[model samples]
Target chain A: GWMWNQFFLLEEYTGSDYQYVGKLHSDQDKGDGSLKYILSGDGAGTLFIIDEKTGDIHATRRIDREEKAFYTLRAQAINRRTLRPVEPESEFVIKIHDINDNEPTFPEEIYTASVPEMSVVGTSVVQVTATDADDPSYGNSARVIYSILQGQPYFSVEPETGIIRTALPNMNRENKEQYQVVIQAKDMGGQMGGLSGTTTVNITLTD
Target chain B: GWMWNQFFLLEEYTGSDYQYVGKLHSDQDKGDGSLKYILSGDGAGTLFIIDEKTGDIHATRRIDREEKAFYTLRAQAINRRTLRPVEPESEFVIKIHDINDNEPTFPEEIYTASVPEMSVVGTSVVQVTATDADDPSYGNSARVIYSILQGQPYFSVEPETGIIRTALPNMNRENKEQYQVVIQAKDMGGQMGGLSGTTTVNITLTD
Candidate 1:
């Protein structure tokens, strides 16, 4: 019987420059004879390959977890001389780990929220939601924090819920009836090495 | 944020009588309102359904792990009145557990091997291989052990590997030139409740 280690990789990474990931051993070809290994899967043969003699697995290209989060593979071993199977075919799984590689994205690039003129402060205007593709289980990979990057003195946003509200009382709809605000969403808890995304919100002061 | 326990089921069993296997919860629809939960993926919408009011999941029919070992599903929650999504869709995985319900199967039902008459003990005659469809890592679930059910006095087998050899050395091909041997392969380490399979081999004594 053989054993396999926990398989995982980071998005957009090349498996530490094609380092040896795992090995396939055959019990039938025990002596001095060499064994051949075959790996088949969605990205097999192109994205990964096995050594003909050593059965070492290596990556052929960078794997983007966003494109595909995990891969299912089938492995088989055979004797090099007889070309007969040594062991029954088995299946394995490889999962891609979370990385702060994707930025938060809003459903709409531009949002329009309507508010009555001379509205009181703390009046809820609209809710803008953004989603991150990174792993949410990881502490900061997909945790999105929101902020009003521009027009903050007149408008405010809730960091956790992405809710925008009127922060100042207005006089009438006569002058400057429309306000443009830039909202920013930063993934990875808005810390260093974090990725950021921006959206525009246009507030129309209705009469 | 929510957590889902791994979903498992035995092959040929009807999802434990179609009991609730999983639950989908939305942060927006806490209570007091009607919400609809939708499950989509392999064998989704038709083969599985969710309780619109309770967000509980159930199987519509028996799931055969032999046909499909696992399923990947996407869940979405929305307001029944507005049909508006309550939260972003999320993905989950369901795995089938091995139950040792399948017998081992040999590629060839009958095999032929020849050895010289009066061959020495431990002389290799032939090797037989069988495979089980159950998961290999579940202790003894898919572990197969071999045995020589018949012709024990003349032949022997390797328990781990299905290699058969000569156990005794005797007369030439004149008296008895042929022997019929019956081999059995039992999954689950040959324990009780395990499944078994058999194949026959014809050994010819060569002068």
Candidate 2:
């Protein structure tokens, strides 16, 4: 058993290189200076390198999670004097973790949505979408969800689809022709402590 | 004299073609049918036409005050019996009076103006401009004036320049940070029956 960790999690979109990655350990050779480790596969020598004496691995370059999610590599243990393999080769992975550095963005700050008067409940009015620049493959960093801020029961928005629908039936424009709805798009699966962006939907009821 | 009125006043931006322009009368005719009138000069026979017997002139085409302010024309009267001039050739001018047909317009409906906090009175915050499409040469039809519609003693707008300025000294942002001032622009020198346009100014007293 050479590699101790199944996968190492490294933060992406950072500003550095030659950071410590992980360590390669072997039980047979102990610390007698009689053992050496070799790295192969998936940017072994160029992007990732290991200290021959200490078996400590390090990343030699910066990486982006949005470009590539993870990297795979292999490591082996060998005798230093004989230059022969002492253990079987082991395959491991390094996963690039995501950071909430990007906020949800809308096409415009205000949207004009016009619907016919006297519309039934659940009528489709408009759809507003906000996009985040984080990695969508991992976790909820790029997942966006919607919540109504200003407009109440008169309008409702689908959390996942960003679709605005009417919540009331037989709405009369004579009573109130204009309505304003403030919609919020949040990352981290709409959970607490997430980045947020907002947009205003100007709803007008016409004959 | 045939053409009694040297010029005429007519409203612009109307929805008509055949409008009564002016009337012509000769004192030598003595209300008889022997006098013949001839109409010539600017817009003659094309934009305007006159009845030879009655000498009544009417605009046959649509006219805009903004395109050209006034027009010049000439009238002649002769005796039908002798086929000679009863009086000398008379030259005249027809002026198109202005009507409050255009409204003041600004670059945007809403503007954001930020100024340093604790400033002196008459400190300039921002300058807004409004333009009208009426005739400005003859009278005050297209002359624009600005007035503060809302956010009273805190801010004021110059009547001619549309400049928003602070009205009080030592204004503290901590007391009231955000101010919404409604600025109004009116044509016709801000007099009665003038068309008006309004804009909202979102002001922040910043440090």
Candidate 3:
């Protein structure tokens, strides 16, 4: 079977920088003319450009970060003149692998929620979470924004997820009850400028 | 001045042995054998002990951690034989100092509060705060405990201060509108054990 990385259905993506870092070889061809590379466009059908010289497929764009976060990929080989699918996928199969890209980002830079000054002792403040396009580990990315949220003067957020909450129930409406917060999202990519995002939260105080 | 380092105040106090990491001195007289050393105690009181020989006074106990925490110390310095009042006014100068001995504690280890099934966004929940017996810095520490009270299963607590707030509005009384939480309180006194407390909460559905 072809071992190419699959670029799934992206919510909002424009193909400009797609890079194919894989090679193809037909097991039956024994490294002969039977080895033909194949490349495809952004979520488009296959069977496009084929290199006659090196059996390497030619395509536009080099890489797609957002797309890599979706699913696994697969690429097969084919006949150049006939443009028909080739036998023994690996006889000329290409491995379109994926690399860890994409930075983490919050749903929004600023969020708004409200809580009452006289609200009961136990009440929910607000919920928030972050997202990353990169894979987990080398980028087994986990979105946690709570640590920074808790030190705020008026509110706190969860550590593993960045959900904001209140620290006290004695919110004296007369003095001040509403709160404005800033959140940040980061992944474990550990690159020169790893992926990161930020969001803000506005909490309203009520009865 | 009671020599560089000698057994004074019935303690193994060696001026040379001590790195002089702290400051604790008082006014005194070289003549009349009315040596007075100011002794400060934590928890609430200052005592002035007099040294009849070098006019140097010393504290009965080691009150190094006082002044900022809740501490209590004793001082006794009198005129050897003549028993004359070198500074009689110093007799009633009871300095109630603070020492970092007692750790802060919460009412419970885990506390929970509840809200209505469909309480509005700005609804209030249970409120909590921490308190320390020691002075500010050492035990002047306190925190609040916030968690899911009731309503939807979407809610969380503030990490730094324990403010409970909404996460999502997935209301399901049958599954989980009730929350079980653990609250904690601790003392800032570095050496002393940090004390903690907690509580619980129950959510009810209103009309």
Candidate 4:
């Protein structure tokens, strides 16, 4: 059998207050929508912040990020007149997911590379593969850096790979084999690495 | 849809074959009775083999497993004296329906294990679990091994726990934090077609 637990919120406001900013969820289907409240401190000091649809509780005044930053809600019994609010042992925890509202833009907008088939071992062949969304100049949310997470038995990335080189020498088609590599560019401090970008490079030894 | 191919078997023998060697399905739910045929040498070079009930044609004569591997019967039509036998592709295929004659069993009736925590990465931790049914030793099938699918990073499954050991070492509780290890056991050589069993082990950090 499922438990019967409903939640509601209270609003305390005066005439000076114009709007209420809060959140509400109808029918306990997890968090639904942000809530709003209204009030009139006139008759009986009992103003009705009414909701025609669902009739759930709504705040009576708009609250600044500083004034009671978040909405506080409580649940009570319908039959009892003076029933105290019920607080759950563990409050409902809602995780706010971030939105990807940023567009992708590459540095230099266009880059070129010419990696020689012959190079020393363990050398950084490719630099970083980086990108940005916001203006590359402003330090807020736009500036980004790129790095090579993995590279080079064939070719190493400097992480810093607008350029390309060889990771090892011992190259001679008769003596050695294939050379393959992957280059990736990420945006926004390289934290939000999206899979929308990638490049591959292959070098052949003519000697 | 998976097509479960059809399968059953038929053979021939002498009149006494049914009473002598024919063994019906003891646990068959359909109640089909077992029957057999008997073949003998008449010395006249002619063979007389017939079904017990329908008196249908069976085999020509007494055949030896080594001398006469197998033989086919040909049917012909005749107009008074002229006989006409038309060549027809043999539709008679042999089948041997498998009985639930095999009970699952473990490779060894008894398994032993004495693994040290300091062993190399490939060390086996425990012996596999097993069981059988058919008819004690005869019916039982193979018992598959179970492994710790999920566990502390240091600790891991060695191959279905049939032989489990450390994937890492610092995994030891006192030396590490709590651990949740998932162990799964499968039957029939890990074939998904067979029955399966599973278990879990929780290790709390001590130190």
For all the predictions, what are the DockQ values? Answer: 0.01, 0.00, 0.00, 0.00
TM-score, structure 4 vs. true: 0.22
Measured on C-alpha atoms, candidate 1 has an lDDT of 0.74
User: Lowest summed-lDDT stretch of 10 residues in model 3 chain A?
Assistant: A1-10
lDDT by candidate, in order shown? 0.74, 0.77, 0.43, 0.35
Candidate 4 segments exceeding 4 Å error: A1-207, B1-52, B55-120, B132-147, B152-154, B158-161, B175-182, B199-207
Better of 1 and 4 by DockQ: 1
Per-residue lDDT over B1-207 for candidate 4, one digit per residue giving the tens place of the 0 to 100 score: 111111111223333322111111111112221222222232111443444222123234443332332233222111212333222211121121122223344555333334443446655555455453322221113445455556545555654435555566444434544455556555554555555555555444333
Best by lDDT: 2
Q: What is candidate 3's DockQ?
A: 0.00
Model 1 clash pairs? none
| Docking quality category of candidate 1 according to DockQ thresholds | incorrect
Q: Candidate 1: give its CA RMSD in angstroms.
A: 18.7
TM-score of chain A by itself in each prediction:
0.86, 0.71, 0.57, 0.37
Better of 1 and 2 by DockQ: 1
Error of 1 at A153 (Å): 80
Task: Please write out the lDDT profile of model 4 over residues A1-207, one tens digit for every residue.
Answer: 111121211123232323222222233322222222222222102322434222233334432222232332332212123333222222221111112225444444434444434556654443544444333432223443444334445555554335655666766666654455555655544564432345555545553
The alpha-carbon lDDT assigned to residue B11 of candidate 4 equals 22
